[PDB]
Design a protein around this ligand. Structure first.
Ligand SMILES: CC(C)=CCC/C(C)=C/COP(=O)(O)OP(=O)(O)O
Ligand SMILES: CC(C)=CCC/C(C)=C/COP(=O)(O)OP(=O)(O)O
Ligand SMILES: [Mg+2]
Ligand SMILES: [Mg+2]
Ligand SMILES: [Mg+2]
Ligand SMILES: [Mg+2]
Lengths: 348, 348
């Protein structure tokens, strides 16, 4: 509803300072590290606040839909909110770093933290501290809950899987080296599973699972199986929207075809090309020179990407309903649809 | 003894592959991430093995001296060994990164991992994975031990304190900017407490404490109080040995006075200088030009550093025996001396 979700929404954002407080209030005056804590306060302020905030809100939704009435107390609520910002902090730590390893300039419409003059390679240690902050907030609000160790293990494992996923990206598409050989479907796919799927979709539901007491390996697997599907599709959509989309598109209607980027668009292009294009492409992708980019898009209309999308997005939604059956046995399908309803959207 | 310690010693090093195995054996062939795991294997191999290995061996000693005969089983032993390499992995993650943020070239006589051609800023994500590896090995050998959550919390907290400590360094002495203002005793001191003291001294004993069952906040504080003393002194010694030491000195008898470095030597120099030197210094430190460095050392003989050391090292040892009393109430002073015996050494 255009009422609850935003209500859910304003509560979350209304929580941020509190978290900031948790993190630096005592540190700030500490005669020894006080200088370190202050800076964290700024590190925190610049980078954390800033997305649409979905991933975090997803904990809060699920929890609000999984818990029984015993569990809807306020503290229980606050914890949901806190574990949410925990995912938001984790992601920030990552983004901070993708940017340095990508020599990027802009993020979430502000100049990258590393580029702020005086920062530099030091953002390496600020990302760590951001990463530290997540387990600091967990100790803070859940250290005495039966699910504490599961949560710790869950944040930590997913960190490892996204990194692996980052590795694959790193090794596959260097941003100072074109090479289209490895831009392969399998690769692309495994890149997405690892680098964003787990942290963006599974992690938030899994956390509300452990919070309500569902700690069965086969149920995490049932959830895992369907959220990963979602998350794959989602990244694809994001990929389809960076080129072929525009009308009221999520703020910045920019691009990175220019950036030798492993995108679903490219990958589909590859497999569906004549050595003529396979070279026409092979040469102009990574190209920050307008003529080039423009050409790149031509090739795609030339090959008719957008329709293949519409056949994809379509296959996708079908396959979701199915796995909502085979796998939403003990859990509330209402969880997967509400999240699904805010996902498959499309633009032609 | 020149028998046990090395026996303790060869067991530890003999363990490394095993750990490597734990880390990559299944990952290596994984059809999805196999490429990511392999590289980790190399990341691991290049950076982990390489110091004298003290910090890790310290767990093993303490444990071997804290446990009762019930606990000397092999698995219990192996765990000690595993939590040891866990500290060694943690440190590697750090070193990997100090180097990038320091634009260094050499480490432990091998060229820095970041400088290996093809690596680059990507070592940012390899340090993360190294950092991930620590909690992976903990899950592996201790997930079902009553001390599991304490250990997790202990590794994680100390990570946060060393980072803070790194922050203070970062902000204090930039390696492309001299400024001697903040090279202050308090600062220097707080830098050391945080960036190396906890991880190098407290962490290893504390871990064998939690392993034997000593989880009292006041005993961790009793240990903490005396190990920090040690660790401060130790860093100082390291600092005294980079200039004024040589005879059979720990391999590389190099230097970094040349690197605008917050060292105890400099700090003592500051406080004990006439604006003449306070400028003679103010100008040639950070200097990679031989005449300069040489001058820098002059100034120190000029002010007579080495003796102030000998008065320091001396104050230090006294104050240790004392805190071994006030604070080694319930614990075995034998722990603190054997570690102490391998610490205060000196060279004039
Ligand atoms: C362990 C680490 C750092 C993981 C980073 C994960 C992540 C979300 C990468 C996305 O960035 P990207 O390379 O696709 O670029 P982007 O949105 O900036 O275009
Ligand atoms: C969170 C992080 C990265 C912490 C790093 C901690 C650490 C041991 C720094 C020492 O390096 P140094 O700056 O004194 O240089 P060195 O031995 O290389 O001379
Ligand atoms: Mg990027
Ligand atoms: Mg990237
Ligand atoms: Mg350094
Ligand atoms: Mg440094």
């Amino acid at each position: 509803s255009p009422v609850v979700v935003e209500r859910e929404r304003e509560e979350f954002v209304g929580f941020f300072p509190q978290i900031v407080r948790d993190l630096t209030e005592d540190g700030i005056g500490h005669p020894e590290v006080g200088d370190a804590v202050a800076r964290l306060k700024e590190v925190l302020q610049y980078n954390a606040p800033g997305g649409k905030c979905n991933r975090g809100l997803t904990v809060v939704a699920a929890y609000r839909e999984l818990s029984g009435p015993g569990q809807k107390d306020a503290e229980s609520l606050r914890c949901a909110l806190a574990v949410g910002w925990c995912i938001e902090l984790f992601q920030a730590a990552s983004l901070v770093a993708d940017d340095i390893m990508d020599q990027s300039l802009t993020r979430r419409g502000q100049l990258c933290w590393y580029k702020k003059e005086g920062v530099g390679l030091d953002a390496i240690n600020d990302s760590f501290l951001l990463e530290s902050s997540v387990y600091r907030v967990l100790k803070k609000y859940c250290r005495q809950r039966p699910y504490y160790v599961h949560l710790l293990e869950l944040f930590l494992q997913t960190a490892y899987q996204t990194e692996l996923g980052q590795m694959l990206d790193l090794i596959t598409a260097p941003v100072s080296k074109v090479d289209l050989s490895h831009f392969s479907e399998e690769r692309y796919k495994a890149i997405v599973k690892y680098k964003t799927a787990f942290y963006s979709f599974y992690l938030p539901v899994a956390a509300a699972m452990y919070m309500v007491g569902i700690d069965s390996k086969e149920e995490h697997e049932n959830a895992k199986a369907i959220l990963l599907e979602m998350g794959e599709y989602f990244q694809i959509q994001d990929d389809y929207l960076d080129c072929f989309g525009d009308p009221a598109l999520t703020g910045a209607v920019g691009t990175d075809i220019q950036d030798n980027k492993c995108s679903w668009l490219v990958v589909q292009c590859l497999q569906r090309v004549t050595p003529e294009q396979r070279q026409l492409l092979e040469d102009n992708y990574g190209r920050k020179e307008p003529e080039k980019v423009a050409k790149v898009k031509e090739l795609y209309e030339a090959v008719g990407m957008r329709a293949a999308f519409q056949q994809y997005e379509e296959s996708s939604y079908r396959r979701l309903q199915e796995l909502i059956e085979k796998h939403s046995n003990r859990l509330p399908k209402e969880i997967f649809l509400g999240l699904a309803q805010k996902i498959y959207k499309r633009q032609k």
